[PDB]
Write a protein that holds these residues in place. Structure first.
Motif, mmCIF file in Angstrom:
data_model
loop_
_atom_site.group_PDB
_atom_site.id
_atom_site.type_symbol
_atom_site.label_atom_id
_atom_site.label_comp_id
_atom_site.label_asym_id
_atom_site.label_seq_id
_atom_site.Cartn_x
_atom_site.Cartn_y
_atom_site.Cartn_z
ATOM 1 N N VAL A 61 -46.596 -15.629 -23.741
ATOM 2 C CA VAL A 61 -47.307 -15.830 -22.486
ATOM 3 C C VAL A 61 -47.515 -14.475 -21.820
ATOM 4 N N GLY A 62 -48.574 -13.772 -22.212
ATOM 5 C CA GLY A 62 -48.873 -12.486 -21.615
ATOM 6 C C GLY A 62 -50.349 -12.166 -21.499
ATOM 7 N N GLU A 63 -51.206 -13.063 -21.978
ATOM 8 C CA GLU A 63 -52.647 -12.891 -21.870
ATOM 9 C C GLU A 63 -53.243 -13.685 -20.717
ATOM 10 N N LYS A 64 -52.412 -14.377 -19.946
ATOM 11 C CA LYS A 64 -52.876 -15.197 -18.840
ATOM 12 C C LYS A 64 -51.798 -15.207 -17.770
ATOM 13 N N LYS A 65 -52.200 -15.560 -16.551
ATOM 14 C CA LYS A 65 -51.280 -15.517 -15.424
ATOM 15 C C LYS A 65 -50.052 -16.372 -15.708
ATOM 16 N N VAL A 66 -48.878 -15.770 -15.563
ATOM 17 C CA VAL A 66 -47.614 -16.441 -15.828
ATOM 18 C C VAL A 66 -46.710 -16.249 -14.620
ATOM 19 N N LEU A 67 -45.890 -17.257 -14.349
ATOM 20 C CA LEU A 67 -44.961 -17.235 -13.230
ATOM 21 C C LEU A 67 -43.539 -17.313 -13.763
ATOM 22 N N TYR A 68 -42.701 -16.367 -13.355
ATOM 23 C CA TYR A 68 -41.294 -16.352 -13.726
ATOM 24 C C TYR A 68 -40.475 -16.904 -12.568
ATOM 25 N N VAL A 69 -39.675 -17.926 -12.841
ATOM 26 C CA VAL A 69 -38.807 -18.531 -11.839
ATOM 27 C C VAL A 69 -37.388 -18.039 -12.086
ATOM 28 N N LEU A 70 -36.830 -17.323 -11.112
ATOM 29 C CA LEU A 70 -35.512 -16.721 -11.233
ATOM 30 C C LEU A 70 -34.555 -17.308 -10.202
ATOM 31 N N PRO A 71 -33.260 -17.418 -10.533
ATOM 32 C CA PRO A 71 -32.322 -18.094 -9.626
ATOM 33 C C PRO A 71 -31.707 -17.186 -8.573
ATOM 34 N N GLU A 72 -31.693 -15.880 -8.823
ATOM 35 C CA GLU A 72 -30.989 -14.940 -7.962
ATOM 36 C C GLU A 72 -31.838 -13.682 -7.818
ATOM 37 N N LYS A 94 -51.186 -20.119 -15.020
ATOM 38 C CA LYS A 94 -51.368 -21.036 -16.139
ATOM 39 C C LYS A 94 -50.041 -21.448 -16.762
ATOM 40 N N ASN A 95 -49.050 -20.561 -16.772
ATOM 41 C CA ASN A 95 -47.800 -20.812 -17.474
ATOM 42 C C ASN A 95 -46.620 -20.610 -16.537
ATOM 43 N N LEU A 96 -45.570 -21.396 -16.762
ATOM 44 C CA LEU A 96 -44.393 -21.421 -15.899
ATOM 45 C C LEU A 96 -43.153 -21.209 -16.759
ATOM 46 N N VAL A 97 -42.463 -20.093 -16.550
ATOM 47 C CA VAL A 97 -41.294 -19.713 -17.339
ATOM 48 C C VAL A 97 -40.054 -19.947 -16.486
ATOM 49 N N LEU A 98 -39.290 -20.978 -16.824
ATOM 50 C CA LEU A 98 -38.067 -21.317 -16.111
ATOM 51 C C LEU A 98 -36.869 -20.745 -16.852
ATOM 52 N N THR A 99 -35.978 -20.097 -16.114
ATOM 53 C CA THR A 99 -34.690 -19.690 -16.653
ATOM 54 C C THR A 99 -33.757 -20.898 -16.714
ATOM 55 N N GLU A 100 -32.866 -20.902 -17.712
ATOM 56 C CA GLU A 100 -31.976 -22.040 -17.921
ATOM 57 C C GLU A 100 -31.058 -22.299 -16.731
ATOM 58 N N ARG A 101 -30.861 -21.314 -15.857
ATOM 59 C CA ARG A 101 -30.117 -21.542 -14.627
ATOM 60 C C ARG A 101 -31.007 -21.943 -13.460
ATOM 61 N N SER A 102 -32.310 -21.667 -13.534
ATOM 62 C CA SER A 102 -33.237 -22.118 -12.504
ATOM 63 C C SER A 102 -33.540 -23.605 -12.606
ATOM 64 N N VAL A 103 -33.333 -24.208 -13.777
ATOM 65 C CA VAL A 103 -33.506 -25.651 -13.924
ATOM 66 C C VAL A 103 -32.473 -26.401 -13.097
ATOM 67 N N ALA A 104 -31.215 -25.963 -13.151
ATOM 68 C CA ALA A 104 -30.169 -26.607 -12.367
ATOM 69 C C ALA A 104 -30.420 -26.444 -10.875
ATOM 70 N N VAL A 105 -30.899 -25.271 -10.464
ATOM 71 C CA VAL A 105 -31.204 -25.037 -9.057
ATOM 72 C C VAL A 105 -32.318 -25.965 -8.589
ATOM 73 N N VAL A 106 -33.372 -26.107 -9.396
ATOM 74 C CA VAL A 106 -34.502 -26.947 -9.007
ATOM 75 C C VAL A 106 -34.095 -28.416 -8.981
ATOM 76 N N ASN A 107 -33.274 -28.841 -9.944
ATOM 77 C CA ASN A 107 -32.902 -30.251 -10.042
ATOM 78 C C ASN A 107 -32.146 -30.724 -8.808
#
Ligand SMILES: [K+]
Ligand SMILES: [K+]
Ligand SMILES: [K+]
Ligand SMILES: [K+]
Ligand SMILES: [K+]
Ligand SMILES: [Mg+2]
Ligand SMILES: [Mg+2]
Ligand SMILES: [Mg+2]
Ligand SMILES: [Mg+2]
Ligand SMILES: [Mg+2]
Ligand SMILES: [Mg+2]
Ligand SMILES: [Mg+2]
Ligand SMILES: [Mg+2]
Ligand SMILES: [Mg+2]
Ligand SMILES: [Mg+2]
Ligand SMILES: [Mg+2]
Ligand SMILES: [Mg+2]
Ligand SMILES: [Mg+2]
Ligand SMILES: [Mg+2]
Ligand SMILES: [Mg+2]
Ligand SMILES: [Mg+2]
Ligand SMILES: [Mg+2]
Ligand SMILES: [Mg+2]
Ligand SMILES: [Mg+2]
Ligand SMILES: [Mg+2]
Ligand SMILES: [Mg+2]
Ligand SMILES: [Mg+2]
Ligand SMILES: [Mg+2]
Ligand SMILES: [Mg+2]
Ligand SMILES: [Mg+2]
Ligand SMILES: [Mg+2]
Ligand SMILES: [Mg+2]
Ligand SMILES: [Mg+2]
Ligand SMILES: [Mg+2]
Ligand SMILES: [Mg+2]
Ligand SMILES: [Mg+2]
Ligand SMILES: [Mg+2]
Ligand SMILES: [Mg+2]
Ligand SMILES: [Mg+2]
Ligand SMILES: [Mg+2]
Ligand SMILES: [Mg+2]
Ligand SMILES: [Mg+2]
Ligand SMILES: [Mg+2]
Ligand SMILES: [Mg+2]
Ligand code: NA
Ligand code: NA
Ligand code: NA
Ligand code: NA
Ligand code: NA
Ligand code: NA
Lengths: 208, 64, 113, 146
Positions: A148-159, A191-204
RNA sequence: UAAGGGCAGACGGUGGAUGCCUAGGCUCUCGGAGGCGAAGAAGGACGUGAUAAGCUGCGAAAAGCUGCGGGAAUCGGCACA
RNA sequence: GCGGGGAACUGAAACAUCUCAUUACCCGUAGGAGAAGAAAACAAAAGUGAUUCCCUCAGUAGUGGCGAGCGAACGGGGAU
RNA sequence: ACUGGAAAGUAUGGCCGAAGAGCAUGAAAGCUGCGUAUCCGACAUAUCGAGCACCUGAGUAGCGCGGGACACGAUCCUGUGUGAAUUGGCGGGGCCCAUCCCGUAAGGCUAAAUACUCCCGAGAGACCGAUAGUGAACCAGUACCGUGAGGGAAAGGUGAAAAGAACCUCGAAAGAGGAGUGCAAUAGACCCUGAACCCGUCUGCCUACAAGCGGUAGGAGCGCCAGGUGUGACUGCGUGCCUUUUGCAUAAUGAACCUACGAGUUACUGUUUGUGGCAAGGUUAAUUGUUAAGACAAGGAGCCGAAGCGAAAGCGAGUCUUAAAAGGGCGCCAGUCACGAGCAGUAGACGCGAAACCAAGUGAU
RNA sequence: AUUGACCGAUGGAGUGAGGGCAUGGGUGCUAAGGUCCAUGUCCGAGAGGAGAAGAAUCCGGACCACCGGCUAAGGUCCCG
RNA sequence: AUAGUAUAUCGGUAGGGGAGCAUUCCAGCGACGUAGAAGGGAAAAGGGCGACUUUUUCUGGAGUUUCUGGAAAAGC
């Protein structure tokens, strides 16, 4: 909905995570999305615009010519809007553009956008990573390894991850956000959403 | 700014449960012996504001 | 933002001024004079589309009258004889036959006379 | 998806715009008629005015007085008491009534007799109607005014 | 036929609209500060150049004088010759 | 900011009480702010304790040729 | 490498990035320049116990007469005339009295949370872009007008670079024709583009027997380039437009023409409605926390709905009227928060226009 | 019988200077293109056709196009 | 407009209602431009209907724009 987890080198590790069904598998409400995005852009507005009305012009209030006998149109003072260089009628005035949306309405629009992402299959879960120093070439590797680097991507970080923020700052189509400040507009803006494995718990826990 | 209630209307009208407006009758103040008891009893009762005047009375009371 | 439609406002005038070419004097190119004249002309055209049907039927009847009279018959009597015999040929066709094909017209007359 | 947003049908509408030509059906006089007071800039309605005839808020008399020691009771009816108890309870009270969102914290409660209270309850309210009190006591209940 | 005139087109004149642009405005946010003057202020007059109308700077030491820190090849203001 | 003086047009579909307005304007005089400020206070047998400012209370209680109009406080939530 | 007057463009192939903000450079530059991220720096100067009855504010509290301020046409202030008590005192709790409660006048001082922008530094804008935006992008409170107070404009753009046109021809020289510079001189100094009204020259068709808002519907001939285009012999019909009116060709109003300018807007509080969220509940306001203005999470005070009737005490699916009843009146037998839209009021409130009123000044050249 | 033409609730209006003709009248002079009412109608807000040319007399209610046909009032020697 | 193609209806001032076009700027997905953008002249063609749109050619010499949504200094 359970999704596989990849590493920085973009290789599945077998470990899986689960996404809350009330967050990612609802029926999207498209009118709720429309209102939340409209509110977001309105709250970004700064309404600093103005033109001068008749009581704000620099001319004197003196009557220019006598009422009768001159043979032309009757005239009052020099600030009339009918005159060249006169008052601007019903021009801009400084405005606050914000409006209210019900709290439950905004929560539903957040879930609809995430459901759209989950349905279009534009969600990647990657293992949490931290850099020793800021290096833009290092963060480009993760994006290139995740494809995911040819189109707008969003990185979701917990800290905070100050090193990671500085490594991804110079790259054009890259956005970083904290997992607790997620809003509708920023989800739908990439276009793309990159969730960190610790950001899933935060969102849930937060947006359940 | 806020809408202001007319001071004379809020001392002469009242609302009921279904939204009608309570009012008194005129001609009941000081010239009374020459009128009939039936007339005076009908005038002593409370009444409602007529449909054609409800709009004006509601505007005076601020649509209340 | 400030919105002024300079190009669009001026284009509306230029399109109409192409339609007023050929007029006399200021009526062809001066904007408020020309637009006044053009609008009045459009009212004439709506009325003159209707009068066209009146003028062309009157011209067909006049030619039919002259052709019939060369064969000893007026227009009113010839038409009365055609409608009596069920002939449904219209006046535009008959006038054309009267002028350009006089032998066919003479056969219609010889059928009802 | 910011490129393909759409609101619900019939949710947004264009605003009226007057004084912009004949085709709109709103130009020229711009919905104001021809002359008179109502056609001028700055006309506003005089709310009580009736043209000079004595207005209705003056032809009629004033009445009554307001008591500065008036006491109002929030009415809590019988059928609510049996519904709330079974849903959530065998001893009803104001702090329980507030906790179930049926009355505000600083509010006084009177129990009325619109329904049935078959379930046998002890009741703590500020006030009771005669019929309402009898309904609880007949149904093997207790009434505590406090 | 054309003294002259009408309409259309081509090419020009005049005038300075329009498009594009900015050197100046307008409304604010955040931080600071909220005075100058009898040790003579604000604001002015008159002067001051190789050359010198007007602005700018300056004050008979008059486009300026002396130190300290910075900086490194151009410089004698706008501004030329 | 605080003091000393202080209009009229206008509204009341006229006008004098009233309104415009303790405004415009004139004069005197501070500070980085000024004024206020530590109960001869509110409340109602239940309580809160200096002053200032914001959200409510509320267009409410009142006031008024009881006309046009004008318009609190108590109590509660905050900043400090 | 190509196009180009000129690459920063386009197509290859590289590289840097805590720097892909920007401005400039002969077109649109992360890697040409000034910069930007980041790091490092000051000789100066500036700033950061019992008893006891001794005391506890006087022309003061209070009062009469006349005024003022309090939301207000008991409380506070006072011009004028008067005038207490002392802790068992004195003041207040909306005339006043009694009781009870609260508090100690006639002495003073105090930060914060609040108000503002001549100014300095750093930034921004679903703000303007030269008749706009400040009156003022230039020269501006200037020129100009007035005795004076005071009033108060117009006016931006050659070109990448002056390379700003040596020299010749006609002219007494102004002006031009050339030459030359330049991508371009129809970019030549009033210079980017270069519209309209208005003004010329040329070419094509028509026009000196003809009479009305000047067009419209037909219709030969002629001239150009395969049925299009310019013109229009002759014919039919036809008293402009706006506004105001019972009714206007009206001899009622209005405009020389063109280009530009020019008139229902916004805020707040309601109400109806289209669309949504939640639902017997709905919703937060000020403000607070985290992050970096926004975003996310708190904040339930308050507001509306949930019971009505009665002037009220008060009763309650009833209530009021009645001595009571019957009768009769009013009630009983899905809301709320937003978004868009219509309308209303308060604000100048669709625009232009008085004669006038008041305040402070300037004038007897 | 009737294209549905009526009513309630609720959002938004405009109008509150009318005019001609026919019929019944008052007034005036059995005057007025006069004036005041009543009942219809048309103009107002309505083009087309006849009347030489006329707001409301006679015929007739224009969605657009047509170089088709039948008629109304009124006409058929020529302008037509 | 009613019924789902049929029947009816379509002159209009004050006035009420419905549906659209153009203009300036913004968000998003995207395109065009020194091998010639905007603007200006000429010509041709489109639209249930229209406000308007498209193409070609000359001038011009650097910016312009489709669609969906949003906001107005939004039309003489
Ligand atoms: K009267
Ligand atoms: K020209
Ligand atoms: K001739
Ligand atoms: K006249
Ligand atoms: K543009
Ligand atoms: Mg004045
Ligand atoms: Mg201006
Ligand atoms: Mg406007
Ligand atoms: Mg009495
Ligand atoms: Mg209309
Ligand atoms: Mg008009
Ligand atoms: Mg008018
Ligand atoms: Mg009138
Ligand atoms: Mg009117
Ligand atoms: Mg006015
Ligand atoms: Mg020209
Ligand atoms: Mg220009
Ligand atoms: Mg040195
Ligand atoms: Mg008055
Ligand atoms: Mg000082
Ligand atoms: Mg302070
Ligand atoms: Mg008392
Ligand atoms: Mg200007
Ligand atoms: Mg050229
Ligand atoms: Mg030029
Ligand atoms: Mg003759
Ligand atoms: Mg008249
Ligand atoms: Mg009229
Ligand atoms: Mg006429
Ligand atoms: Mg004349
Ligand atoms: Mg007049
Ligand atoms: Mg005139
Ligand atoms: Mg005229
Ligand atoms: Mg005109
Ligand atoms: Mg004009
Ligand atoms: Mg009247
Ligand atoms: Mg009348
Ligand atoms: Mg008459
Ligand atoms: Mg008569
Ligand atoms: Mg008359
Ligand atoms: Mg009619
Ligand atoms: Mg019809
Ligand atoms: Mg119609
Ligand atoms: Mg405009
Ligand atoms: Na109109
Ligand atoms: Na000639
Ligand atoms: Na000296
Ligand atoms: Na009874
Ligand atoms: Na070209
Ligand atoms: Na214009």
């Amino acid at each position: 909905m359970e999704l596989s987890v990849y590493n920085i080198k973009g290789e599945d590790t077998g470990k899986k995570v689960v996404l809350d069904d009330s967050i990612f598998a609802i029926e999207p409400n498209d009118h709720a999305i429309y209102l939340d995005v409209k509110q977001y852009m309105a709250n970004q507005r700064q309404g600093t615009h103005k033109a001068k009305e008749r009581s704000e012009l620099s001319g004197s209030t003196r009557k220019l010519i006598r009422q009768k006998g001159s043979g032309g149109a009757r005239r009052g003072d020099i600030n009339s809007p009918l005159l060249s260089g006169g008052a601007r009628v019903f021009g801009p005035r400084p405005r606050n553009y914000s409006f209210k949306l019900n709290k439950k309405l905004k929560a539903l629009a957040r879930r609809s956008a995430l459901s759209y992402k989950a349905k279009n299959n534009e969600i990647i879960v990657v293992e949490d990573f931290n850099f020793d120093a800021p290096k833009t070439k290092a963060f480009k590797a993760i994006s290139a390894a995740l494809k995911v680097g040819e189109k707008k991507v969003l990185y979701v970080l917990p800290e905070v991850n100050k090193n990671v923020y500085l490594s991804a700052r110079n790259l054009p189509n890259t956005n970083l956000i904290l997992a607790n400040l997620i809003n509708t507009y920023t989800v739908l803006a990439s276009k793309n959403l990159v969730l960190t494995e610790r950001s899933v718990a935060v969102v849930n826990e937060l947006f359940k | 700014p806020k809408l202001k209630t007319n001071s004379g209307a809020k001392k002469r009208f009242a609302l009921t449960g279904t939204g009608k407006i309570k009012r008194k009758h005129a001609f009941k103040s000081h010239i009374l012996t020459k009128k009939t008891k039936k007339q005076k009893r009908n005038l002593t009762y409370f009444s409602t504001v007529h449909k054609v005047d409800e709009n004006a009375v509601k505007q005076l009371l601020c649509l209340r | 933002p400030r919105s002024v439609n300079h190009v669009a406002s001026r284009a509306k005038r230029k399109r109409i001024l192409k339609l007023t070419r050929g007029y006399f004097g200021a009526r062809k190119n001066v904007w408020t004079v020309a637009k006044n004249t053009w609008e009045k002309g459009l009212t004439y055209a709506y009325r003159d589309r209707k009068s066209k049907k009146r003028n062309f039927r009157a011209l067909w009847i006049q030619r039919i009258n002259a052709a019939a009279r060369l064969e000893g018959m007026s227009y009113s009597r010839l038409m009365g004889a055609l409608h009596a015999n069920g002939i449904e040929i219209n006046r535009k066709v008959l006038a054309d036959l009267a002028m350009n094909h006089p032998e066919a017209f003479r056969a219609i007359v010889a059928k009802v006379k | 998806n910011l490129s393909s947003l759409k609101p619900a049908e019939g949710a947004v509408k264009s605003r009226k715009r007057i004084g912009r030509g004949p085709g709109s059906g709103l130009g020229g006089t711009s919905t104001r008629g021809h002359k008179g007071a109502k056609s001028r800039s700055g006309y506003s309605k005089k709310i009580g005015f009736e043209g000079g005839q004595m207005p209705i808020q003056r032809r009629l008399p004033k009445f009554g007085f307001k008591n500065i020691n008036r006491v109002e009771y929030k009415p809590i009816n019988l059928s609510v008491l049996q519904t709330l108890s079974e849903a959530n309870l065998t001893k009803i009270s104001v702090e329980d009534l507030i906790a179930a969102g049926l009355v505000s914290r600083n509010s006084l409660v009177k129990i009325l007799a619109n329904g049935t209270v078959t379930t046998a309850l002890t009741v703590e309210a500020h006030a009771f109607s005669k019929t309402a009190e009898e309904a609880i006591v007949r149904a093997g209940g207790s009434v505590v005014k406090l």
